Design a protein around this ligand. Structure first.
Ligand SMILES: OC[C@H]1O[C@@H]2O[C@H]3[C@H](O)[C@@H](O)[C@@H](O[C@H]4[C@H](O)[C@@H](O)[C@@H](O[C@H]5[C@H](O)[C@@H](O)[C@@H](O[C@H]6[C@H](O)[C@@H](O)[C@@H](O[C@H]7[C@H](O)[C@@H](O)[C@@H](O[C@H]8[C@H](O)[C@@H](O)[C@@H](O[C@H]9[C@H](O)[C@@H](O)[C@@H](O[C@H]1[C@H](O)[C@H]2O)O[C@@H]9CO)O[C@@H]8CO)O[C@@H]7CO)O[C@@H]6CO)O[C@@H]5CO)O[C@@H]4CO)O[C@@H]3CO
Length: 586
């Protein structure tokens, strides 16, 4: 089968006549002479040469004795007669850095995707994603050492679960030489990085997240050609993998296979539930449409949908290509979800404003609804927004510290109610003050000592996650106009916005935000479902170090017309706060 080349190519365990060893395979159409230099070979390129079969362009050889755990490389004479030693491109495990040898290990057992994890990826599911860079989430304190995959299984997984997230999204765990690329500049697509342990350690981590009831999304980097360690370029002396600045030759059948293969591998051999492709614009552009890139993405998506249904793909595309998360049969790219960068830009510009000026930019909060139904959106507060002098999310907020925290609380309240799934970068849940530093631990010291405003934000994010998951109105109909309706879309003067989220049964949750520090008392607005209403979420609660203003129990609607509706509520709206209300059955 052509889809799963990692099941044949590379180093696997084989049984050629009683004797055991490993069979090596490499694809290099126009090289001449390739030998296998391992640990079993005293590292001698005279002892073990490979026999090429020219129909496929694949060299191969079976070596008895050669067992799992042994380092190895390929010694190749390239088209030009140069001696270069190459890493196996299908290295399933790579030796500790510097170094670049591959390790014989073979494949892990296939992971079957469970019904409850497939359900967890569906469009009607509450999806709240904790985005993490494994190298900088936590460190050991005395020595500043990385946490291993296994320590991450014992600390990060329980933390994410308790905080009420449904998904853990990982910056690329591909093998990569430079910590500073964050994993986006890989050298070994099929080996999880050795920074945190072995490939079996990574697998234990994935297993642990699943046992805790978490789906795992992996950042997958099919758009960043390896540019380090002569790892993939001019692989056999010619432009094997890359186009004739370095970029994959997607239209070339085998290359495409190498990449679609890689997706299938993470999902099938590691149990990953979803992949995210960054920087899609620079795959499809940079009239300038790279037609081979567009068809490759269309293809890969088609194949995953047929082969591993239940798994999903997500995309970040920054030029408004139409139909990124739409079906290929139409103009689409075939992704299930798209990052809503426009929403992130508009709402942050809005929150940055001195509250006194927000009346003039009401547009920034109401625009998201206009194009909400063109893509299946994730609302993202990602690692890219908290580096390079962009500041932390907290530090973007205006005012003295206490006003900053209140603005940030009100904003999360808004984000968690607004149509679209949720993604939050580590550090944001406890309002880290400093920018993200991939070479240090996050600022957990902020949570040391007596209860403070950072604990307050952290409780709020948990309550938001648990509330968002419990009520279907908040998540069931994000991508259906029936799921959302403005109750007060034009109170610009006071910067009060009020809408309703709705589930399939037609139950409504009312969402109200007051984006200025003026408290509003007896604020009357029209509603759709008369009766008794009660707060289920209040970002000004003392439980989060707010001032504890609010409605103080059940409020009954009145038969007094408002905003073209026949019944209304008259509520207190706390300053710099958002509240959610539910209707009580009688
Ligand atoms: O081709 C690209 C699309 O965008 C282009 O839109 C341009 C406008 O035509 C142009 O006038 C101008 O608009 C800007 C405007 O000047 C600013 O003031 C501001 O608008 C704000 C507005 O003032 C606020 O009130 C608020 O709007 C909310 C609205 O008040 C509220 O009721 C609700 O709206 C829903 C309606 O209740 C309901 O009727 C329905 O309306 C549908 C429509 O019936 C249906 O045909 C649907 O199908 C298409 C649509 O026709 C297309 O036009 C397409 O948009 C493109 C335009 O053609 C471009 O010209 O979108 C739909 C595809 O799904 O369109 C309507 C939307 O469903 O549903 C409404 C939505 O629920 O919610 C709104 C939103 O909160 O907020 C506004 C602040 O953003 O901003 C305008 C943008 O600049 O410039 C536009 C250029 O982008």
């Amino acid at each position: 089968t052509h889809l799963r080349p990692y099941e044949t190519l590379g180093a696997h365990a084989d049984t050629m006549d009683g004797v055991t060893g490993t069979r090596f395979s490499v694809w290099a159409p126009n090289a001449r002479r390739v030998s296998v230099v391992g640990q079993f070979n005293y590292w001698d390129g005279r002892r073990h040469p490979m026999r090429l079969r020219k129909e496929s362009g694949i060299w191969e050889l079976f070596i008895p004795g050669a067992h799992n755990g042994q380092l190895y490389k390929y010694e190749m004479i390239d088209a030009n007669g140069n001696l270069r030693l190459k890493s196996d491109p299908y290295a399933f495990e790579a030796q500790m850095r510097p170094e670049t040898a591959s390790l014989i290990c073979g494949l892990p057992e296939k992971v079957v995707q469970t019904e409850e994890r497939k359900k967890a990826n569906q469009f009607d599911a509450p999806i709240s994603i904790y985005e993490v860079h494994l190298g900088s989430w936590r460190r050991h304190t005395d020595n500043n050492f990385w946490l291993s995959y296994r320590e991450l299984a014992d600390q990060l997984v329980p933390y994410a679960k308790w905080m009420g997230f449904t998904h853990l999204e990982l910056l690329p765990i591909n093998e990569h030489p430079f910590d500073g690329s964050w994993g986006y500049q890989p050298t070994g697509l099929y080996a999880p990085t050795r920074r945190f342990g072995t490939r079996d350690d990574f697998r234990y981590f994935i297993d642990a997240a699943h046992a805790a009831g978490l789906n795992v999304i992996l950042d997958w980097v099919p758009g960043h050609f390896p540019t380090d360690d002569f790892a993939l370029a001019e692989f056999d002396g010619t432009n094997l993998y890359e186009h004739s600045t370095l970029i994959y030759n997607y239209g070339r059948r085998e290359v495409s296979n190498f990449l679609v293969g890689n997706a299938l591998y993470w999902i099938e051999r590691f149990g990953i539930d979803a992949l995210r492709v960054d920087a899609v614009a620079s795959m499809i552009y940079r009239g300038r449409e790279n037609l081979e890139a567009i068809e490759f993405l269309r293809n890969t998506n088609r194949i995953l949908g047929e082969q591993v249904s239940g798994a999903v793909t997500m995309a970040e595309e920054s030029t408004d290509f139409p139909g990124v998360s739409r079906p290929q049969d139409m103009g689409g790219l075939g992704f299930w979800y798209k990052w809503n960068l426009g929403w992130m830009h508009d709402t942050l510009d809005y929150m940055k404003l001195d509250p006194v000026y927000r009346q003039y930019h009401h547009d920034k909060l109401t625009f998201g609804i206009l194009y909400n139904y063109t893509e299946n959106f994730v609302l993202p507060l990602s690692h890219d927004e908290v580096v390079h002098g962009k500041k932390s999310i907290l530090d973007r907020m205006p005012g003295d510290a206490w006003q900053k925290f209140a603005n940030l609380r009100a904003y999360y309240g808004w984000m968690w109610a607004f149509p679209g799934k949720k993604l939050l970068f580590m550090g944001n849940e406890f309002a880290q003050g400093r920018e993200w530093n991939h070479d240090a631990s996050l600022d957990w010291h902020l949570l040391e000592g007596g209860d403070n405003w950072h604990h307050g934000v952290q409780r709020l994010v948990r309550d938001l996650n648990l509330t968002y998951r419990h009520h279907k109105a908040m998540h069931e109909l994000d991508f259906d106009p029936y799921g959302f309706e403005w109750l007060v879309v034009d109170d610009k003067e006071r910067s009060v916005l009020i809408f309703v989220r709705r589930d399939k049964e037609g139950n409504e949750i009312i969402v109200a935000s007051n984006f200025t520090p003026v408290p509003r008392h007896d604020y009357r607005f029209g509603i759709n479902q008369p009766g008794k209403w009660r707060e289920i979420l209040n970002t000004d609660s003392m439980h989060y170090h707010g001032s504890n203003a609010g409605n103080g129990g059940t409020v009954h609607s009145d038969e007094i017309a408002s905003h073209g509706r026949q019944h209304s509520l008259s509520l207190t709206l706390p300053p710099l706060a958002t509240i959610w209300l539910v209707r009580e059955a009688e």
